[PDB]
Design a protein around this nucleic acid. Structure first.
Ligand SMILES: [Mg+2]
Ligand SMILES: [Mg+2]
Ligand SMILES: [Mg+2]
Ligand SMILES: [Mg+2]
Ligand SMILES: [Mg+2]
Ligand SMILES: [Mg+2]
Ligand SMILES: [Mg+2]
Ligand SMILES: [Mg+2]
Ligand SMILES: [Mg+2]
Ligand SMILES: [Mg+2]
Ligand SMILES: [Mg+2]
Ligand SMILES: [Mg+2]
Ligand SMILES: [Mg+2]
Ligand SMILES: [Mg+2]
Ligand SMILES: [Mg+2]
Ligand SMILES: [Mg+2]
Ligand SMILES: [Mg+2]
Ligand SMILES: [Mg+2]
Ligand SMILES: [Mg+2]
Ligand SMILES: [Mg+2]
Ligand SMILES: [Mg+2]
Ligand SMILES: [Mg+2]
Ligand SMILES: [Mg+2]
Ligand SMILES: [Mg+2]
Ligand SMILES: [Mg+2]
Ligand SMILES: [Mg+2]
Ligand SMILES: [Mg+2]
Ligand SMILES: [Mg+2]
Ligand SMILES: [Mg+2]
Ligand SMILES: [Mg+2]
Ligand SMILES: [Mg+2]
Ligand SMILES: [Mg+2]
Ligand SMILES: [Mg+2]
Ligand SMILES: [Mg+2]
Ligand SMILES: [Mg+2]
Ligand SMILES: [Mg+2]
Ligand SMILES: [Mg+2]
Ligand SMILES: [Mg+2]
Ligand SMILES: [Zn+2]
Lengths: 36, 154, 90, 56
RNA sequence: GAUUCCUACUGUCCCUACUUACAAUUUUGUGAAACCACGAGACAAGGGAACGGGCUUGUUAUUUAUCAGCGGGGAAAGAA
RNA sequence: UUUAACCGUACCUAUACCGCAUCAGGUGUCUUUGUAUCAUAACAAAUAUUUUAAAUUAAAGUAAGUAAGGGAAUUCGGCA
RNA sequence: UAUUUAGGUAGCUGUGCAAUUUGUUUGUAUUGAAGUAUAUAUGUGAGUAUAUAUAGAAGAAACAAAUGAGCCGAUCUUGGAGGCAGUAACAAUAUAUGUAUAGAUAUAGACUAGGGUUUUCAAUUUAUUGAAGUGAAUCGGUGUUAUAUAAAA
RNA sequence: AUUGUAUAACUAGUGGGCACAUGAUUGUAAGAAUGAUGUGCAAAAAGGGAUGAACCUUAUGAAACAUUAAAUAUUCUAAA
RNA sequence: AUGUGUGGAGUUUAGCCUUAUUUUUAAGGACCCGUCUUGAAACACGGACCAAGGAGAUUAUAAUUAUAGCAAGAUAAAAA
RNA sequence: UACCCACACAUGGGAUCAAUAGGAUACCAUAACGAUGAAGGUCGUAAUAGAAUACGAAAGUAUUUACCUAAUU
């Protein structure tokens, strides 16, 4: 019904740097049976 | 503005309260709130204060792989138990707010009972870390929604 | 070493501003711009096909050519003091 | 076909299709130059060589 | 730099024993990755693409649904 | 003597530089108190930072110690 | 009037269902079109038709036409979200009244290269906003040259 | 014995094969290599050889009822 | 991919086909798909999960088959 | 208590359908730069101003046109 004031509530400041941390590069740039 | 899954038969004598997207871990608040339903409201606040001072434990039932055994979990016929701090303080703030609306609407505090308790998942907040050989891995966290309704006894 | 231990020694700066192009590609020892080749009169031909897009004619301000196009479509407004004077030329 | 991509080759646990080179953004490392790639050209592009009129 | 022998010396060995600190075992907070056809319990022999977790005849486990170890197997994982 | 023009004068020396980072790595020069019978090593001044789970009890690890009698019989080799 | 014929990998031919746009004809809709979710009937099958809930503005059928015209796979492309798992790996000084009494670890301070407001103060909780702050005849550059463009030691 | 026979035009796939019965060449011998005649698997269902690409009965749309073949009749398992 | 409420089975066995109102059970059948291959359930390779995208279309020159107009002749060559 | 199934209600995500001050192709007209200082760049100007956009000490709505720039005593 109603939400109240609390110290565990969300922040609008954290949402600004959150989407900044969501865009990067996904992909980037004695063996078996050895004889001579 | 999360809607409740509770079906209200009488609009009087039903008190609801709500916290949306709280900054507490989801898997730990689910473990604490499994035994709060069908209790008096006064017995709940006394029980949650004993978890903070480590006198009563919480029985882990769903997510319980790798929990230490203890003797305080014999009261639930169990063998595993833990005492989470920060999850109990978030649930205590919800139960005090219900007690304040009851004295404003003039209801009797002893007659109330907990009726509908559910929590659910929430959108994530992303993060970062830097590992060995120069690789980058995600480090995000997972909040939850908390929904609690209280009803008078007959 | 070649890797992390040798990246501490990089604290010397070689390229500075150019007068003609505005990029940071003017060598201070070779005394030449690496993008416009500054001390020569003619400008350098660009390196690729996309490089002709980035600074073409018309992405600027066009302080003069905006006027010249506008007198082509509509006629030019004249100064009446100047118009009387030009008729008195031999 | 505007970019300048090239295949990276085998030995990297990745496909053979051409990858966008460079760095510094989310774009670098994605596929290009194929009909099954996103923002890539289609195979058999249409053209104005097609016969538009018949003869009776 | 490469090789052999004498003297001294010693837990390298006969043959191992005892003490302390830091990680580990127990609690709170922040909270990932490799890998994944299906995996719902495990064996003996048979035939088969001539070394089966599943197919065919036989012999068999089970603490209210755990916790801490260990490196026999998954012809274990990496790299057309 | 209405004589001496133009530009920079805050702050950081490593948690305010470079290594994708509040990274045990790297980076030019100078100064710095007292005991210290060759010095070295070590300790103290000066100055700057810092707040709250359990414990005589695991196994196997990473470091530091001691060992009756024998003295290279261990091992490719006195490797440690 | 199949009392005679009917399996089938590679492969060849015939009859049919699904999608987007174009000409002509017929018709539906704010007492509710397109989409989506559950049932029922029907077809050997690709599929079709109807009923109930939700939503709010345009869509269907017949005779002919044009193709960017039907996915389980390509170590396929882009986005979203699992198991392993609250598991590995890291952080965790004392006081009954305190702007103090103690404990603990680390040598410290100036010029240049690099950084550019991080400086100082106020208000709200290593953050956000707003003001203030750099004063030169004698401290650096601007000057001379290193045998036809060179020095902040 | 056969109601047709004969003639043209256009075009695809394939050119690494293996097994059983009869009889051979090389080799001490091989689930070895290479030829000859017939039929199969490849591309072939159901029933039986416990299980098996090629062994034995046997020609092909959807079903119901009776008769046999191959093979079996202590029990698993229909049948003295 | 998850949360809450109500109802139901058992602890010795996931999912599928046939026949049954003992359908949260019983008797028979039944190794995981795609692909090279003489031969694949293979101790041969690719595939953890959903949505959307994704590969014999166009043009020139010849030939055969079907259709339409005229026929000892046939034709929208550029242009007007 | 955990594991499995059936139904009803709520989270998570942006697929489907409908719209559109955007693009693509063909045709027609034009085919006008600069020492009388071009194209391009750097710095400044708003009563309370950051991005974008317009403008030169006559500066955020018929004249002026800061400094480099072929840049030219
Ligand atoms: Mg553990
Ligand atoms: Mg790390
Ligand atoms: Mg690094
Ligand atoms: Mg150097
Ligand atoms: Mg140099
Ligand atoms: Mg495109
Ligand atoms: Mg410890
Ligand atoms: Mg076995
Ligand atoms: Mg065998
Ligand atoms: Mg274990
Ligand atoms: Mg290879
Ligand atoms: Mg100063
Ligand atoms: Mg200073
Ligand atoms: Mg330094
Ligand atoms: Mg450091
Ligand atoms: Mg101990
Ligand atoms: Mg000894
Ligand atoms: Mg001794
Ligand atoms: Mg010896
Ligand atoms: Mg020996
Ligand atoms: Mg030695
Ligand atoms: Mg057929
Ligand atoms: Mg297509
Ligand atoms: Mg798909
Ligand atoms: Mg396929
Ligand atoms: Mg992906
Ligand atoms: Mg630690
Ligand atoms: Mg500040
Ligand atoms: Mg074949
Ligand atoms: Mg058979
Ligand atoms: Mg047999
Ligand atoms: Mg019988
Ligand atoms: Mg069976
Ligand atoms: Mg082979
Ligand atoms: Mg095998
Ligand atoms: Mg292999
Ligand atoms: Mg794989
Ligand atoms: Mg599709
Ligand atoms: Zn330049």
């Amino acid at each position: 019904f109603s939400s109240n004031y609390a110290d565990h509530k969300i922040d609008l400041l954290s949402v600004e740097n959150k989407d900044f941390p969501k865009k990067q590069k996904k992909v980037k740039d004695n063996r078996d049976r050895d004889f001579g | 503005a999360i809607n409740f899954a509770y079906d209200v038969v009488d609009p009087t004598k039903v008190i609801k309260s709500q916290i949306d997207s709280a900054r507490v871990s989801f898997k730990k608040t689910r473990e604490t709130a499994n035994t709060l339903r069908k209790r008096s409201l006064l017995n709940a606040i006394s029980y949650l204060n004993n978890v903070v001072v480590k006198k009563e434990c919480v029985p882990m039932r769903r997510y319980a792989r790798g929990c230490g055994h203890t003797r305080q979990a014999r009261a639930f016929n169990q063998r595993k138990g833990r005492w989470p701090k920060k999850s109990a303080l978030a649930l205590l703030q919800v139960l005090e707010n219900i007690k304040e609306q009851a004295v404003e609407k003039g209801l009797e505090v002893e007659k109330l009972d907990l009726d509908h308790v559910q929590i659910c998942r929430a959108p994530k907040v992303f993060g970062r870390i830097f590992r060995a050989h120069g690789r980058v891995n995600p480090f995000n966290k997972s909040p939850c929604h908390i929904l609690v309704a209280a009803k008078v006894r007959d | 070493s070649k890797g992390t231990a040798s990246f501490g020694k990089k604290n010397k700066r070689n390229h500075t501003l150019c007068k003609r192009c505005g990029k940071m590609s003017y060598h201070k020892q070779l005394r030449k711009c690496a993008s416009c080749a500054y001390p020569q009169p003619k400008m350098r031909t660009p390196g690729s096909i996309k490089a002709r897009r980035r600074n073409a004619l018309g992405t600027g301000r066009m302080r003069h050519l905006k006027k010249v196009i506008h007198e082509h479509v509509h006629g030019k407004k004249v100064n009446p003091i100047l118009a009387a004077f030009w008729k008195t030329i031999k | 076909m505007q970019h300048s991509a090239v295949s990276w080759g085998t030995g990297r646990a990745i496909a053979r299709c051409p990858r966008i080179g460079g760095g510094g953004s989310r774009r670098s490392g994605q596929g290009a130059f194929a009909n099954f790639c996103r923002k890539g050209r289609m195979a058999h592009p249409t053209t104005t060589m097609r016969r538009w009129c018949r003869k009776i």
